Design an enzyme around this catalytic site. Structure first.
Site, PDB file in Angstrom:
ATOM      1  N   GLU A 181       0.880  -1.160   0.059  1.00 18.28           N
ATOM      2  CA  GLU A 181       0.158   0.093   0.157  1.00 18.28           C
ATOM      3  C   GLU A 181       0.818   1.208  -0.040  1.00 18.28           C
ATOM      4  O   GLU A 181       0.400   2.405   0.174  1.00 18.28           O
ATOM      5  CB  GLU A 181      -1.241   0.114   1.191  1.00 18.28           C
ATOM      6  CG  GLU A 181      -1.534  -1.006   1.846  1.00 18.28           C
ATOM      7  CD  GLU A 181      -2.333  -0.820   3.361  1.00 18.28           C
ATOM      8  OE1 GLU A 181      -1.657   0.406   3.639  1.00 18.28           O
ATOM      9  OE2 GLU A 181      -3.216  -1.515   3.579  1.00 18.28           O
TER      10      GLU A 181
HETATM   11  C1  DMD Z   1      -6.367  -6.324   6.106  1.00 18.30           C
HETATM   12  C2  DMD Z   1      -5.429  -6.051   4.946  1.00 18.30           C
HETATM   13  C3  DMD Z   1      -4.797  -5.080   4.604  1.00 18.30           C
HETATM   14  C4  DMD Z   1      -4.058  -4.851   3.465  1.00 18.30           C
HETATM   15  N1  DMD Z   1      -3.354  -3.663   2.649  1.00 18.30           N
HETATM   16  C5  DMD Z   1      -2.776  -4.148   1.830  1.00 18.30           C
HETATM   17  N2  DMD Z   1      -2.756  -5.546   1.653  1.00 18.30           N
HETATM   18  C6  DMD Z   1      -3.802  -6.051   2.547  1.00 18.30           C
HETATM   19  C7  DMD Z   1      -4.513  -7.303   2.952  1.00 18.30           C
HETATM   20  C8  DMD Z   1      -5.158  -7.375   4.013  1.00 18.30           C
HETATM   21  C9  DMD Z   1      -5.904  -8.847   4.513  1.00 18.30           C
END
Ligand code: DMD
Ligand code: DMD
EC number: 2.4.2.21
Lengths: 347, 347
Positions: free
Chosen positions: B315
């Site tokens: 992210e």
């Molecule tokens: C909770 C969660 C947050 C994330 N943020 C990026 N990939 C993800 C996968 C999950 C499961």
């Protein structure tokens, strides 16, 4: 007394660390996915001076300054006076640690523990002598001197908690100091000097043999006992190195984190953990120093630095560089949301 | 047009980099001693959008969100809806990248490039479709779709310069996305899928074979051409991956730095540098991802990350984590004093 200080370093808080682990696993990400940010947050949670949670208040980098008789053995191309000059530059904010400490929102405490020059106005005076003894012919100092310095620096360090400090960094400034550091790393780890003697501040490749001989001669003549870290410090260390060990003992006594810098600081950390194993859980690496002996020293501390910057300055700039990573671990822990509140269920 | 964008990425400024090197060597430290902080400052100086000096103004992390048809092949244990849920959490500041971007003083731009759910109010809408095609049976999307998305994201990215942004970070959010990333890394580097398929978000060790088969089948059926990065993106990538490539092309067109995050971002960087080699000097690694294929991807980019955090979130949290290191390089360059002014002469 030093015996009291050592005896009363607190153990890490297992209960606070369990609570921390459970809170981290519950946050909005796959379990484990923030890796060593997560393990850092748990390590911080266990430090009793942090009050049961990863947090950072005020930050202080303690810069320990001193000169070394072993300069006279031809092991350093930096003019000896640079220690005094640069120590005065620390009062004007123009050095690497000052600049990086400012970026990180940390204050720098410049502590003269034995520079070979007149005292510098505005620098904390804990001078043991004008430079330590030449470790190639005899000891850097007496045991009593090393002990007195450890006590006084550890007291000054833990007293900073009363002004809101929760996160320390350590560094050293002293021409020739990668020589006693290499001697100490050799003695504590049992590696021959050739494996752990580096270029320090741009020593020409052709003068390395001399510096290896000098380290060997220092250990030969002083016969430091590897199982008595104060012995090692007093015989083949220097005042700056003893000063950094002192900061580690004080942070640990205070139940608070201390960020190492580079090779100089690894040598002091080796001495600190030998003197009091209970120091180890308080230590946090910053970067993996460019100096030849870094790997060996870090392996003996089972330490894996976060940052790979090929840095070799010291003065604490590496510690200051890692302060934002500690703060990031706390921001993760306190500010992330939780899986349950978004109704996310993972296997 | 995309051809214009690619053609007009500026070369790095050699003159500004020479000036930068000379200024760094003159600062108050042994030459070379701040290591990769120094090489970073010089790299920054060469980026024409920084106006001939390492500097940071505003910072933006661009988070590219989309769902993937290949989820249906059993390659991800995270429920598909997590993409939509977490994308909405990005509006409330509760995610890892939001929290770490805040610590670093960066703003987060959440861009939906193809989530399989209703649009999320307050998220930038560039949706190509509700999820991309299942790469195991056919392409993720058409070439026209990949091209249109690259253009639009690169424009949005370079337009941020007009609001003072000088430093970007990139990341992706999309369940199953470590599958197309592994496919792209395999195609660009010529490593078999088994060498570069990782656990992503906690895939059980026992489901790795399936995920290897899925990647192979994707490459087999699509026959992406490794010498045409847009081909590779459209066939075995995803909208999020194309979206990150777009940010890299836009930062590069703008003559500005972009921080990578982890494995997802390495795949997009491989595509970006294939499409336009002139992108490479603008890219800055952050951390060395825990994902199995990280080493191979980074070796093909000749990239050595600063941070070793065993992180695997993405992210953008890793990019945000490295922003303070870029700022430290600039603080070193601008705020340190000089050898000459202290009359220090070194050999
Ligand atoms: C909770 C969660 C947050 C994330 N943020 C990026 N990939 C993800 C996968 C999950 C499961
Ligand atoms: C200028 C200079 C600054 C330093 N800081 C720590 N060691 C040093 C050595 C030199 C030569």
């Amino acid at each position: 007394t030093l015996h009291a200080l050592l005896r009363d370093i607190p153990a890490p808080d297992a209960e606070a660390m369990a609570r921390a682990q459970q809170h981290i696993d519950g946050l909005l990400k796959p379990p484990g996915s923030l890796g060593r940010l997560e393990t850092l947050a748990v390590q911080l949670a266990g430090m009793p001076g942090l009050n049961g949670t990863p947090q950072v208040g005020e930050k202080a980098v303690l810069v320990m300054c001193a000169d070394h008789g072993v300069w006279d053995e031809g092991v350093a191309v930096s003019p000896k006076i640079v220690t005094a000059i640069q120590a005065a530059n620390m009062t004007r904010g123009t050095t690497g640690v000052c600049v990086l400490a400012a970026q990180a929102g940390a204050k720098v405490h410049v502590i003269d523990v034995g520079i070979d020059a007149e005292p510098i106005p505005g620098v904390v005076n804990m001078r043991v002598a004008r430079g330590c003894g030449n470790i190639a012919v005899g000891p850097a100092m007496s045991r009593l001197q090393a002990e007195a310095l450890l006590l006084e620096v550890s007291r000054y360090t833990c007293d900073l908690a009363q002004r809101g400090v929760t996160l320390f960094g350590v560094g050293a400034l002293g021409m020739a100091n990668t020589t006693p550091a290499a001697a100490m790393v050799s003695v504590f780890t049992g590696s021959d000097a050739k494996e752990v003697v580096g270029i320090g501040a741009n020593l020409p490749p052709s003068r390395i043999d001399n510096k290896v001989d000098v380290v060997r001669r220092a250990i030969a003549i002083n016969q430091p006992n590897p199982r008595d870290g104060i012995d090692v410090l007093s015989k083949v260390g220097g005042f700056d190195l003893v000063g950094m060990t002192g900061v580690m003992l004080g942070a640990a006594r205070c139940g608070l984190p201390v960020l190492l810098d580079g090779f100089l600081s690894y040598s002091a950390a080796l001495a600190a953990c030998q003197i009091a194993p209970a120091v180890r859980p308080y230590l946090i690496p910053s970067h993996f120093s460019a100096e030849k002996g870094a790997r060996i020293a870090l392996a003996h501390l089972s330490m894996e630095p976060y940052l790979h910057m090929a840095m070799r300055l010291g003065e604490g700039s590496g510690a200051a560089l890692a302060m934002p990573i500690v703060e990031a671990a706390c921001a993760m822990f306190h500010n992330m949301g939780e899986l349950a509140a978004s109704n996310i269920v993972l296997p």
